[PDB]
Amino acid sequence: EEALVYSYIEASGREGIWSKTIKARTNLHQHVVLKCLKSLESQRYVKSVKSVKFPTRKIYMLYSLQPSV
Amino acid sequence: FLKVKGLVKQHLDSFNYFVDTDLKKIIKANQLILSDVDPEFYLKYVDIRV
Amino acid sequence: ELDIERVNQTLNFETNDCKIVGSCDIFTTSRKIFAYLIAILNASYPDHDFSSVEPTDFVKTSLKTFISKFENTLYSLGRQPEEWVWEVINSHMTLSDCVLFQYSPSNSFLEDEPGYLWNLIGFLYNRKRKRVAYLYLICSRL
């Protein structure tokens, strides 16, 4: 389950992903993917960046350091 | 015929069938409760009686 | 509990082309309280950060003024609001001697949710019991 969310970050590729857009293709258990990203934050792969777009939403992206304006 | 049957048997036998057979065939159709958070805390109903 | 389940069965319904989903909850888990409510907001909606908007619009209004239009909107939605609810939320929390807060900023975080119509979010801080109720009503459209 932790590998398909890697490709979905790679589906975003450059900007990042919001956590309820995960359910557009996954629609898995809402709490299993809730605590998976907390351990994935502890995995030191993904990070919680803030939205260049409309704010106040949890944007996650791997260590690319690549936002826009 | 009417001695051991009666005239309200179509109400009485059906309700006796429900509380003696069909209560089991409802519990067995959905026996288990599956907790999605921590999929180990299950809950199942063994049988039923009124 | 059972009475909390009843007052939550009150606040979740749907009429012809509107769907209102809201509830109340009470749990123990003005400078220090600014972080104490954004955790409630984060746990209430685990897809938006609420550490961002720190100097928000907490309109520290009277609770009687709040329950006034909170009752008026239940008249306005064909509900005929049942009075025992306001004792039940009293009976767990001692509604009289407590202060009310309200997250109502300029642009709330539900305007981007499709089908959003309006909200009514109530915080009720308690001091002696530390019992904060998160009374929220989200009217949507489907």
Swiss-Prot record, chain A:
Localisation per UniProt entry: Nucleus
Documented effect of changing K47A: Cold-sensitive. Abolishes interaction with BRF1/TDS4
Q: Which domain of life is it from?
A: Eukaryota
Subunit info here reads: Component of the RNA polymerase III (Pol III) complex consisting of 17 subunits. Interacts with BRF1/TDS4.
Q: Which family does it belong to?
A: Belongs to the eukaryotic RPC34/RPC39 RNA polymerase subunit family.
Q: What does this protein do?
A: DNA-dependent RNA polymerase catalyzes the transcription of DNA into RNA using the four ribonucleoside triphosphates as substrates. Specific peripheric component of RNA polymerase III which synthesizes small RNAs, such as 5S rRNA and tRNAs. Involved in recruitment of Pol III to the preinitiation complex. Involved in the configuration of an initiation-competent form of RNA polymerase.
Specify the protein name. Answer: DNA-directed RNA polymerase III subunit RPC6
Q: Which organism is it from?
A: Saccharomyces cerevisiae (strain ATCC 204508 / S288c) (Baker's yeast)
| Section of the entire sequence shown | 89 to 157 of 317
Swiss-Prot record, chain B:
Compartment list = Nucleus
Describe, as the record does, how this protein assembles with itself and its partners: Component of the RNA polymerase III (Pol III) complex consisting of 17 subunits.
Q: Spell out the note in the miscellaneous section.
A: Present with 1950 molecules/cell in log phase SD medium.
Function, as annotated: DNA-dependent RNA polymerase catalyzes the transcription of DNA into RNA using the four ribonucleoside triphosphates as substrates. Second largest core component of RNA polymerase III which synthesizes small RNAs, such as 5S rRNA and tRNAs. Proposed to contribute to the polymerase catalytic activity and forms the polymerase active center together with the largest subunit. Pol III is composed of mobile elements and RPC2 is part of the core element with the central large cleft and probably a clamp element that moves to open and close the cleft.
Tell me which family the UniProt entry assigns to this protein.
Belongs to the RNA polymerase beta chain family.
Task: Provide the protein name.
Answer: DNA-directed RNA polymerase III subunit RPC2
Task: Specify first residue, last residue and whole-protein length for the fragment.
Answer: 51 to 100 of 1149
UniProtKB/Swiss-Prot annotation, chain C:
Q: Which family does it belong to?
A: Belongs to the MAF1 family.
Species, as recorded: Saccharomyces cerevisiae (strain ATCC 204508 / S288c)
Where is the protein localized? Cytoplasm; Nucleus
Modification(s) after translation: Phosphorylated by PKA in a TORC1-dependent manner. Phosphorylation at PKA consensus sites RRxS/T decreases upon rapamycin treatment.
Give the misc comment.
Answer: Present with 1720 molecules/cell in log phase SD medium.
Listed PANTHER family: REPRESSOR OF RNA POLYMERASE III TRANSCRIPTION MAF1, REPRESSOR OF RNA POLYMERASE III TRANSCRIPTION MAF1 HOMOLOG
**What does it do?**
Mediator of diverse signals that repress RNA polymerase III transcription. Inhibits the de novo assembly of TFIIIB onto DNA.
Q: Which protein is depicted?
A: Repressor of RNA polymerase III transcription MAF1
